[PDB]
From a paper:
RBD, which directly binds to ACE2 receptor, is a major target for development of the therapeutic nAbs against COVID-19. The prefusion structure of S protein exhibits more dynamic conformational changes in S1 region, especially in RBD, which has two distinctive conformations, “up” and “down”.10,11 Only the “up” conformation of RBD can bind to the ACE2 receptor. To further explore the interactions between nAbs and S proteins, we solved cryo-electron microscopy (cryo-EM) structures of the S protein in complex with ten nAbs, in full-length IgG-form or in both IgG-form and Fab-form. Bivalent binding was revealed for the full-length form nAbs, which showed that the full-length form exhibits different binding mode and induces more RBDs to the “up” conformation than the Fab-form that is monovalent.
The structures are labeled according to the number of RBD bound with nAb as mono (1 RBD), double (2 RBDs) or triple (3 RBDs) binding, respectively.
Author numbering:
A (entry chain H): 1 to 224
B (entry chain A): 347 to 543
C (entry chain K): 1 to 220
Write the structure that this text describes.
Amino acid sequence: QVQLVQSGAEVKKPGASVKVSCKASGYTFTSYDINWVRQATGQGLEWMGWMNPNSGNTGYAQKFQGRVTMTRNTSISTAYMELSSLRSEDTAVYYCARYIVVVPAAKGFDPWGQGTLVTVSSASTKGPSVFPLAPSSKSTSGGTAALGCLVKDYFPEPVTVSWNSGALTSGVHTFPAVLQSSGLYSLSSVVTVPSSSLGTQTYICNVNHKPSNTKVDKKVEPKS
Amino acid sequence: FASVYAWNRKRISNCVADYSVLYNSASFSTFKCYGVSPTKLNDLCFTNVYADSFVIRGDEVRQIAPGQTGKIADYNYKLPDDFTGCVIAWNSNNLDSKVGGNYNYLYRLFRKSNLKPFERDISTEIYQAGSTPCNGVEGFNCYFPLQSYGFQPTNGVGYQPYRVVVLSFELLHAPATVCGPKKSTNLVKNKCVNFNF
Amino acid sequence: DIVMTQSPDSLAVSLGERATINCKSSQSVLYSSNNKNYLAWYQQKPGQPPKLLIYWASTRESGVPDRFSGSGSGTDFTLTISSLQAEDVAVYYCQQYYSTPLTFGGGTKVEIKRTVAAPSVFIFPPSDEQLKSGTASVVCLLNNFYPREAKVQWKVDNALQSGNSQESVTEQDSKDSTYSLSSTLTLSKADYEKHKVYACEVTHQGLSSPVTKSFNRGEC
Ligand SMILES: *[C@@H]1O[C@H](CO)[C@@H](O[C@@H]2O[C@H](CO)[C@@H](O[C@@H]3O[C@H](CO)[C@@H](O)[C@H](O)[C@H]3NC(C)=O)[C@H](O)[C@H]2NC(C)=O)[C@H](O)[C@H]1NC(C)=O
């Protein structure tokens, strides 16, 4: 079927090289040009089209030149992309699309890759440090009061914090992680709960770090 | 067989055509007759019969019919809207599909304008999609116009190769031509009989 | 060369409305009689790959209901979704075609009906565990709120603090179309222990005058 499969959500150190894959299906493959795009955190896109079914001269975006290399295999129709000499600000997500055509002129991109992750930075990997942010009268207002968990200083971007093993879905809001100057991420997830219920029930944040194997449950209680 | 974008064209001529050996052969997966129902073929006479031959996918046999659309009927092989003949088709997976992919069976997938009926186009010019002259080189909006079925023996039906033959009976304005056979009988010497010689 | 400057941004308007997103540069009518256009419209759900909308600029939607509806001319055009409905909240880019690259930026959220509303504010002092480690995070939370154009001013002993905070904000909420914001102030243990009052002063359209939530370091 009309599909595009990417793989390789990974982490690199600056001054290195990476190869990224897009697997296709449900088509003749060598008949539609593969086009990749960059996308930062909440930004636009770029990277002009290039590469063709047969041989294909391949193009570029003229500020990415030399570092960019495009190789594929006629064994199944899987286009790739080799980037080199990474500078720890090219950390982004990278896509694939088939750029389908029809008699007159092709109309936009046919499909759309699932995207991938490349994170560049001399950090390697580190586990999160967790604190509970207690419910307080400065957070309390009338009928409700808010409490949460601060999970900070970790490199391996995908991290999750749940409330009570996934029980509370009301008021639970995890905020986007922030990238510090130290190079490590940090975030805080907070949930509001009736002020009559400050310590009454269970509010334990379950912190799981999937690139590592960290799993810790922290209880949040009103301030002493 | 012959490609789908350059079909063949045999002009059957004066002879004795027996469409019964065709009609009852039970080896054909598709035998549709349009101008004339099949059983009455061995009882009529025309001026010329043409036979066109090619190879397509399994599920593109429904575009070989009068009044269809699609990449095959648009610009590979177009049947007029008052067709007269019959269309025959049978699966040929074991002959035409080979492990690793048989990349010798191409089809045209871009053309300026749909074909006139029974028109044929074997050119290989770079399809200029964009206003930018292609100059004869590939690139964005400058595409090679021919694609190839990569047939492989482990393909689901509807992606295996089917061979197609389109018989088209035409009647110009000559004096006669090919017709069906005609049986006879014996001689009943000495018996008032009703005869036709 | 061809820059696709899109004017409007964050059209957080009540569902059903009729947004009008304009952009243009350096016409691409494309000769060859094919007088159509040259640029598609896109829709990218947050946390998702993009999708395809109106192309050729010519309303040519594919598996897409009619409310999403394009237009076109030689240089200027617009997407103009009608009778907008929940789950059309996305980011809407443009194209260029024969050009080379792309360019576009747009999106929406909500608006509501009641007053401009206001955030619940809450300040959290650093946990005793962290002060062992030798650093103090001071979190201030702003809960539910439409106008995201909120200001978070940290003050330490009444000194406005500049350059040691970070904020992040949530996606517009699919239920009540509000936004929530978390600002973190980061200090050393040593510098933390040098001051007393930590305050977080929030300014917002639903507040007649700013709200300050504050604590006093070392007071149970
Ligand atoms: C891109 O296409 C290539 C073919 O053009 C694929 O290549 C072959 O991959 C085989 C693994 O599936 C390798 O296999 C064996 O390798 C061992 C160790 O090197 C040898 O001892 C064996 O003799 C060898 N056996 C055979 C019969 O291959 C092949 O060495 C390798 N050869 C070729 C033709 O390159 C690639 O795998 C394919 N890559 C992708 C991503 O599609």
